[PDB]
């Protein structure tokens, strides 16, 4: 291969790797645990995809399924999703937690699918269902096993035809950044917790905000990822030869070349800054990451 | 630069450039309009973005705005969207039809936005509106001017607070692949029609399907684009040196090395096959596009 490089895209122009929305924020926050077990936006610098990480941004926090619908009095319309991969290929329980791009966070999701009715005068529309993610549920979700459930309150049968769907996320309610119920209370094969880090190193976070249901609090719901989707697709598309344990990156102002911070991109696909501050530090989102050189894992960064 | 190359990704793993969904089909169809004036998914091989084309697939068929809401007996809840760019920067009328990623097709869109109420014990939810796109409307839509109107039937005022939104698309009703109403019936700066083509050449189409409202017909609603979003961001990301008018590409079975077809990627960002026939021809979506060489504009391909 050629020497590792990065796509020359400002973070504010990139796609988030865990929720399908723009990257809005670039920051470190030592009050958050630096070893999250995110399953999407996980890639090695040599292009090896980790966890449920897809190449296409469009797959992120979505699923494809053969949908079966029933009406249950006291509950409403119940959807039984037999999962497939989002390109329509067969999903085979294997060395990862779920189909590619399946949500890797917890709470209650509104999803939208194309439905088809037998009702006279009607045929195709989009139906909103409620889908429990986790962290634990009373509904035995097992996307590892290829089977998940949603439901929506309804006075009477919606008279829906069984058919192929792609569920896309409408909103989150009681978001928790912990892995969902992949397998009805049981462990599954997971990408490892992000890390390890040198003393004084913290995780660089690419941040977006999730459409929300909340009753009192207007505050936006933050979700972080280790790399924008464009860097995920770049590494997958290039299969680079990896020389060292880490690459030194300089994040620079595009106009002046002013250094904003230097950081280590570990070849396991997460970025560390040396920062000993107590609270969040945010960065400009209109800078460019430039690959300086390979450095050993033990390389000590200049503090930010 | 290095010689022009392509991201090593199968079309079926890529993101559509005109509607935020997976690429599902690869085809030619000479019965469809030959030289569409698509404004999204438009890029030169040298990296120059055309029309309203964004870098991030998440911007595709979306908009951001400062929303103002009012209730009107007879119509219900009306939204006035003062458009902003999707990174949260000011939108200024300039050398393009609309804010980046604004829909480049016609019909009636259901859109979803984050809404805030001052109703008791409610605060945050997601609200669906109807948004007329075009081709012509009685709504005086002017996204080129930074103003568009949406509405939802309501018996009472929803008591929505004015604030920032990002409109994402829920469904299409009465889809037509003609540019929407960009400037209330007036002309705007557009990317030129796709082309030109040699006599006997036809456009290569990357196809997805749009979530649909349809009372009678279950047939999925097709939408084509010239290049998957991953190719758009690749050209944007690389700023290649360009020699001739065209690059000859071979589309190949990775696993057998079978040649499925050769094609020309013109510098102006579209792919041509030599196809003599009348009706659609579809191709496998699991091949890889390989750059063979620079070739003259006038180079005659081997027919498919």
């Amino acid at each position, epitope marked *: 291969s050629r020497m590792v490089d990065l796509p020359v895209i400002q973070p504010r122009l990139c796609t988030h790797a865990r929720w399908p929305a723009p990257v809005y924020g670039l920051l470190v926050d030592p009050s958050l645990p630096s070893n999250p077990q995110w399953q999407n936006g996980r890639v090695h610098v040599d292009g090896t995809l980790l966890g449920t990480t897809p190449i296409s941004g469009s797959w992120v926090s979505c699923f494809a399924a053969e949908a079966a619908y029933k009406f249950q009095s006291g509950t409403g319309e119940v959807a039984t999703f037999t999962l497939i991969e989002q390109d329509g290929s067969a999903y085979v329980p294997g060395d990862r937690a779920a189909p590619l791009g399946y949500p890797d966070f917890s709470g209650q999701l509104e999803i939208e699918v194309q439905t088809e009715t037998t009702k006279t005068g009607d045929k195709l529309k989009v139906t909103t269902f409620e889908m*429990i993610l*986790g*962290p634990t549920t*009373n509904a035995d979700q097992a996307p590892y096993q290829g089977r998940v459930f949603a439901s929506v309150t309804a006075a009477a049968s919606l008279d829906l035809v069984d058919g192929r769907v792609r569920a896309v996320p409408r909103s989150i309610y*009681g978001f928790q950044d912990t892995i969902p119920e992949y397998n009805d209370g049981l462990l599954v094969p997971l990408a490892p917790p992000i890390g390890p880090f040198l003393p004084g190193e913290v995780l660089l976070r690419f941040r977006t905000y999730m459409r929300q249901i909340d009753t*009192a609090d207007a505050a936006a719901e933050a979700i972080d990822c280790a790399l924008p989707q464009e860097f995920v697709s770049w590494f997958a598309s290039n299969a680079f030869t990896v020389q060292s344990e880490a690459l030194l990156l300089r994040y620079r102002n595009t106009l002046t070349g002013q250094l904003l911070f230097e950081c280590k991109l570990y070849n396991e696909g997460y970025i560390a800054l040396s920062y000993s501050g107590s609270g969040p530090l945010t960065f400009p989102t209109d800078g460019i990451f430039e690959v300086v050189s390979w450095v050993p894992r033990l390389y000590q960064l200049a503090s930010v | 630069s290095r010689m022009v190359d392509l991201p090593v990704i199968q079309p079926r793993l890529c993101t559509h450039a005109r509607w935020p969904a997976p690429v599902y089909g690869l085809l030619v169809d000479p019965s469809l309009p030959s030289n569409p004036q698509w404004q999204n998914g438009r890029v030169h091989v040298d990296g120059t973005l055309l029309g309203t084309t964004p870098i991030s697939g998440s911007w595709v068929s979306c908009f951001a705005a400062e929303a103002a809401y009012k209730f009107q007996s007879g119509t219900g809840e009306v939204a006035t969207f003062t458009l902003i760019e999707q990174d949260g920067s000011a939108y200024v009328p300039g050398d393009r039809a609309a804010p980046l990623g604004y829909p480049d097709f016609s019909g009636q869109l259901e859109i979803e936005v984050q809404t805030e109420t001052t109703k008791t*014990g409610d605060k945050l939810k997601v609200t669906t509106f109807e948004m007329i796109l075009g081709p012509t409307t009685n709504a005086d839509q002017a996204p080129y001017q930074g103003r568009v109107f949406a509405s939802v039937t309501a018996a009472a005022s929803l008591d929505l607070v004015d604030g920032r939104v990002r409109a994402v698309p829920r469904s299409i009703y009465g889809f037509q692949d003609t540019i929407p109403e960009y400037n209330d019936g007036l002309l705007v700066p557009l990317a030129p029609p796709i082309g030109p083509f040699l006599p006997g050449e036809v456009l290569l189409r990357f196809r997805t399907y749009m979530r649909q409202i349809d009372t009678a017909d279950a047939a999925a609603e097709a939408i084509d684009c010239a290049l998957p979003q991953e190719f758009v961001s690749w050209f944007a990301s690389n700023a290649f040196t360009v020699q001739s008018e065209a690059l000859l590409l071979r589309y190949r079975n990775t696993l057998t090395g079978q040649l499925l077809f050769e094609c020309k990627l013109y510098n102006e960002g579209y792919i041509a096959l030599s196809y003599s026939g009348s009706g659609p021809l579809t191709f496998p979506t699991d091949g890889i596009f390989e750059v063979v060489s620079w070739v003259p504009r006038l180079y005659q391909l081997a027919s498919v």
Partner: nanobody
Amino acid sequence: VQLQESGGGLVQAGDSLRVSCAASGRTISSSPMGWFRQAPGKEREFVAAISGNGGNTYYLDSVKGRFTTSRDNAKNTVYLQLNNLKPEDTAIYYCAARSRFSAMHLAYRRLVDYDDWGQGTQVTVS
């Protein structure tokens, strides 16, 4: 499930009361439980909730530090302790159970989130 409330009553501002929501017919040990209050003539509004697994609680801002809820699985009963009462707390207090599909960490906040309701108990603050 059937929900039978008791407690409530009349006290002066700054005094405290208890509402007990005793379940019969089925266990609430894994049921998300909610508290709403309604002054007749006004709409029913959220006060407090406890998640299915009993590990998360959420309170209306204006009552946080004053009201607490806990569930006693042995007695199949959810409790609302109203401390430091104000006239503006004057209402019928309702408990509610969610029986459908649940995220078990989630303190469910909305009327549309619950399935079974108690008859209510009156709290009056002078």
